[PDB]
Amino acid sequence: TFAKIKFSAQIRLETGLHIGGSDAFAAIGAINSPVIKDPITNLPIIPGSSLKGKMRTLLAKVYNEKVAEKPSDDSDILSRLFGNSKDKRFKMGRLIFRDAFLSNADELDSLGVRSYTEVKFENTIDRITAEANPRQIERAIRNSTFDFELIYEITDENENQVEEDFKVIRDGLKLLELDYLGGSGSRGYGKVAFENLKATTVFGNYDVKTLNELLT
């Protein structure tokens, strides 16, 4: 047997995203930390690498039996879902994160919104001397939504592990909603919300109506 099912959801945000791209030497008065932006539309991405890395490191705190030095030392519950470079059974591990691409440029333009990214102005105060040193960092704005999709593959007998993989994946999406995805993080910049969590099977034959209820 073989199947590919798709977790689509909508990453709304609050305290919008800084997720950095080039920290190349910027202009003199301009943005110092530009957010990662698409080359054609010049809109933000929440790329697959950030979602995958955050969701490993947040599920590594939960599903590891033992603290790992590295992703190689992760548990098999996570090594099968995020891959492992060192285990022969777990190279190419079962999940495909995809980049997320700003669903609602038209809804945000329907609202009173000029730019899809804001520049928030910010500084550090020295502790002796109380000098200030400013910052202009870009930030994909608050109520933007992003098309999140996962692909999960169902191979030879991964079939016994299907349900208790999705309990993991759901749980990982519940930890991004309590943590932040990306830059600056502990200073706001983070809050995401996965909405319309729908699991559709795309290739093959799997009964996702016994599963789509788990993601409400």
Binding site: A24, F25, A27, I28
Partner: protein
Amino acid sequence: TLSAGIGLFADKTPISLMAHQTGELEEAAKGNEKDSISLFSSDYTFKFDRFITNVYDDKLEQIRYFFNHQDERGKNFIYKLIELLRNHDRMNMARLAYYLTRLEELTRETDRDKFKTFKNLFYSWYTNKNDKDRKEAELALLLYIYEIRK
């Protein structure tokens, strides 16, 4: 006189792949007037005269004398100097002027004058009109970052 090509390669890349990407560099080193020590890439092909006397004992020794008698500017500063040396339009001369002058007033005022001589050196050989001193500074800072890597 002779003409060398030095290639840097990682752990356990095969010697068939390694002896061929270095033959390209030493035929690019034979690709100028008489001789050259073409370092790491297909560019960086310096003449041996405007090498050892001019990179390996002049510029890298001043870079090493700055960043070892000094505490506050680190690898982030060297990274941005290499970036400004690699891009280099005239607007990057303006941005480098602003950057070095702006960090000069951000030292401890007992480290301001050592930084000021280094600022004048780097800005002099960034805007030197010979066109060689920028390339030599870029490879010299490559070498200094390759030394201090942990």
